[PDB]
Design an enzyme around this catalytic site. Structure first.
Site, PDB file in Angstrom:
ATOM      1  N   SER B 133      44.136  28.716  55.158  1.00  0.00           N
ATOM      2  CA  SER B 133      43.672  29.978  54.903  1.00  0.00           C
ATOM      3  C   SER B 133      42.339  30.087  55.276  1.00  0.00           C
ATOM      4  O   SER B 133      41.467  28.938  55.293  1.00  0.00           O
ATOM      5  CB  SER B 133      43.859  30.450  53.397  1.00  0.00           C
ATOM      6  OG  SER B 133      43.149  31.735  53.107  1.00  0.00           O
ATOM      7  N   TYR B 146      42.610  28.008  44.302  1.00  0.00           N
ATOM      8  CA  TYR B 146      42.926  28.035  45.889  1.00  0.00           C
ATOM      9  C   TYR B 146      41.887  27.741  46.749  1.00  0.00           C
ATOM     10  O   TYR B 146      42.225  27.098  47.821  1.00  0.00           O
ATOM     11  CB  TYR B 146      43.094  29.492  46.217  1.00  0.00           C
ATOM     12  CG  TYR B 146      43.961  30.278  47.310  1.00  0.00           C
ATOM     13  CD1 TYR B 146      45.284  29.881  47.323  1.00  0.00           C
ATOM     14  CD2 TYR B 146      43.268  30.706  48.331  1.00  0.00           C
ATOM     15  CE1 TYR B 146      45.982  30.185  48.411  1.00  0.00           C
ATOM     16  CE2 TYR B 146      44.010  31.076  49.427  1.00  0.00           C
ATOM     17  CZ  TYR B 146      45.409  30.859  49.561  1.00  0.00           C
ATOM     18  OH  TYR B 146      46.000  31.250  50.656  1.00  0.00           O
TER      19      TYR B 146
END
Ligand SMILES: Nc1ncnc2c1ncn2[C@@H]1O[C@H](CSCC[C@H](N)C(=O)O)[C@@H](O)[C@H]1O
Ligand SMILES: Nc1ncnc2c1ncn2[C@@H]1O[C@H](CSCC[C@H](N)C(=O)O)[C@@H](O)[C@H]1O
Ligand SMILES: Nc1ncnc2c1ncn2[C@@H]1O[C@H](CSCC[C@H](N)C(=O)O)[C@@H](O)[C@H]1O
Ligand SMILES: Nc1ncnc2c1ncn2[C@@H]1O[C@H](CSCC[C@H](N)C(=O)O)[C@@H](O)[C@H]1O
Lengths: 253, 253, 252, 252
Positions: B133, B146
């Site tokens: 990401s 995350y």
């Protein structure tokens, strides 16, 4: 006395001593912890507190911050310097050793940052410095746990910077090259050809020498000080030019 | 027939069939796994195998690769796409949630890459693509698990590339921006002002729209193919220009 | 102090924060600037001032030679002068573009070489280039600045590799939005000064503009023997701006 | 093909890999090069060739105008021409330095603007700049190349932001050591060709030189609608070179 006069500084992995000594030299009250008992000598040598601590254990991490906070009277600065490695690629590393490295190198800095942060609020803010590595920005063969954990610590440094800015806490990382710590000097000594490994590791840097722990300490010291008041979220190489080249910085081809 | 005609492709977190359909349309034999049973529909729709798998569990990870390998007859490509998050900064995230995110987002890809790699040897090599990401390269507020896990996956991508090169296995990552997944579309739909939320997230990109899963799939497809034969260790943003700006790429000053 | 007796050259020193910071640590400072106001800065700190157009290669040579003579030695060069030509590639005129590259990229390269020959005489030294976060990322309608600064960032690496054997470290600082007079004026002449200020503050996690003094400290550190094992590095001084993929001081 | 009927411009297309790749997918290709051998490439693929010195701004304008006219439309620009000037900042001549910045940095900016005005007529398109890993990192004695390529990298970002509203994507590829005729000639003119080859192969994890065709594929992908949500990206095509902090194909 001086740039950290009266201030409370926590150093994880303070057994080498360079970082601890540097803060102490500027008037800090230093609490260091280490797995190895030799760290007691460092603390005695500088008028600081020592705690024998296994940072792998979450209960021990809580105990360290609580007891160091109590000993010092305040927390202004946390330096996360403890790290381990599990040699091997993803093909050869055992999952327990992988998880141990992630726990110590990544999860422990996160946890300690949160604990230290609650203390820093009491004095209106502070600074966190994470000692990552150039091995958090790039990888090498057969060091997957270290590369992954350190890569995570690099982006965690950014996360903490964003989240802790409201509490007036700056968070940065230093990314050292090959530093002449006792561990690195023994790795050299135990290598198949110590003489060539020394030359090869010196030559990973444009300055064509190993870094000294004191040189890392200075970078940590600066980033933790008010001189760096508009610096947060930054990752500073302390690598004598290593990451400035796409090959060996101290031996082009 | 096509660029993956006859080839065996494993897709973790393939419940959103974009990636699996992309490989299938190029003639791949696709084995996908997912925690959610809906992935069965995807597999049936494309003539592939489905396995209900919890990637958190190391035994389940082993079982998936073994059974998928057996079903497909060969493993050529692994796509690690499964991810979770634990909302919160380091101050608010609970350690068990943190450790589960690291297990799923970082440890699972490492483990699965090793398992898949042993299979790829049998066919003389292959390709691995990790879906990281932009949140592995930068952070945002309240998303520490995350950010850290994805940051680790980015450098792990590099580690694997170096270590798996001798096995003729290329390893790359794609780093998506905001993608119009059903989770993302629903958050928009349930927000006090859906048109504002959409406009804000669209404007994180220079192209001023959300990405489509199919767009991520094409990037994954390319990196897994022989068209990318001299590309390994690379991290490719698929973010419509988001990381090209130091602020909102789609909403300057 | 930390630079007691040392000779320090600062390009674009008319602002004064950097010059003052080195002077405060005992440096002999030679600054140059296109604007004559830089004379006040030099007088205020006991340093030399040269009115210089860094666009002109002859003037660059003359500056280093005369500053070297004035100071007796060169230990540190700070390349801080910069200009911009507003516009995308579609609207920027080639002469403006070439002038920005000359001043922001070519001048630093040239000045680094000249200063380097003088640093040899004293056994080494340090160069600090003031780049910008706009050398690492871009923004809309600022192509000359983005390109020139991007080049300066990689030039910083080039110089670090090449000048290492001469015991000269070369680093860059990459500032965010700093409350310089130029920046404060832009705010002031904005249709909504309050909004513009709030927007630019919120580019940073610390949710304020940087002060020139804060940039000066970073430059000072990188130029000192405390950064002995730091060369080729690009240090953001951006209060967390580049730590986020969106506005660091205002997430969405 | 992915470019059936589309008009594609390739600067420094004389090597031919990139041109061939687009032609193979049905593109109408106009290429230019300083070297007259690009005519053989153009003839071989049913495209137009223009002998052009990209250093000259008038020649850049004439190329886009005439290529646009020849093709009927412009959908894609690939900026692939580059030069180098040997030396660190200490030894490079200023005229050679400026010539590299003109061809490697100014020319792509200019050509992007010219091509962009043409792409508007067909509702958008894609630009791909061939930068280098030497735009992200440096090496000893290659300052002009490192600076110019570093600028091209951030220019790629600038163009992506500015040209997004015109529905034009802009990306770069950053090649490692590619087995062009120039690279192989340098290997042959080396005192130890075998050693030089082994050293340059070992700059990559894949421990071989890249082929021009491999760069072409990357360029092709980034220029196609398969890459619709990719703009502003810098894609290494370097067989793992930049994944290591040392030699990717020879750890120490
Ligand atoms: N679990 C743990 N608890 C406490 N100290 C630890 C520790 N693991 C390692 N250390 C200490 O931390 C230091 C190693 S870290 C060395 C520098 C750098 N952070 C790196 O990543 O290499 C040593 O002093 C070591 O004994
Ligand atoms: N433990 C697990 N096992 C299997 N699939 C999982 C999983 N955790 C998540 N997934 C699946 O992975 C997908 C979510 S990840 C979505 C794309 C990208 N990695 C991101 O993080 O945004 C979903 O299909 C989800 O059900
Ligand atoms: N050609 C030139 N010669 C000398 N000084 C110059 C100059 N062009 C600009 N300057 C000066 O350089 C300074 C620019 S300082 C402003 C910050 C700058 N963007 C940076 O971060 O580098 C100003 O004092 C300006 O007057
Ligand atoms: N000024 C110029 N005008 C036109 N073509 C040029 C040129 N300079 C170089 N070329 C051509 O364009 C190609 C550049 S060769 C070097 C390109 C490589 N990607 C790199 O970045 O190093 C060759 O075919 C060369 O002959």
């Amino acid at each position: 006395m001086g740039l950290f006069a009266g201030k409370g500084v926590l150093v994880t992995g303070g057994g080498i001593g360079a970082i601890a000594q540097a803060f102490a030299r500027e008037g800090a009250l230093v609490a260091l912890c280490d797995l190895r008992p030799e760290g007691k000598e460092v603390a005695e040598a500088i008028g600081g507190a020592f705690f024998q601590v296994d940072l792998e254990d979450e209960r021990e991490r809580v105990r360290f911050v609580e007891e160091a906070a109590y000993a010092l009277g305040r927390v202004d600065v946390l330096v996360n310097n403890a790290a381990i490695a599990a040699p091997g690629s993803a093909l050869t590393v055992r999952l327990p050793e992988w998880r141990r490295v992630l726990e110590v190198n990544l999860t422990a800095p996160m946890h300690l940052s949160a604990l230290a942060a609650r203390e820093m609020r009491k004095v209106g803010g502070g600074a966190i410095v994470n000692v990552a590595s150039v091995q958090g920005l790039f990888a090498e063969q057969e060091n997957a746990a270290y590369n992954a954990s350190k890569g995570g610590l690099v982006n965690l440094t950014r996360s903490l910077a964003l989240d802790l800015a409201p509490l007036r806490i700056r968070v940065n990382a230093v990314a050292p090259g090959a530093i002449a710590t006792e561990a690195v000097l023994e790795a050299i000594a135990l290598s198949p050809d110590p003489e060539r490994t020394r030359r090869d590791w010196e030559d990973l840097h444009a300055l064509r020498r190993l870094g000294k722990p004191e040189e890392v300490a200075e970078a940590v010291l600066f980033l933790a000080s008010e001189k760096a008041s508009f610096i947060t979220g930054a990752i500073l190489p302390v690598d004598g030019g290593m990451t400035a080249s796409f090959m060996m910085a101290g031996r082009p081809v």
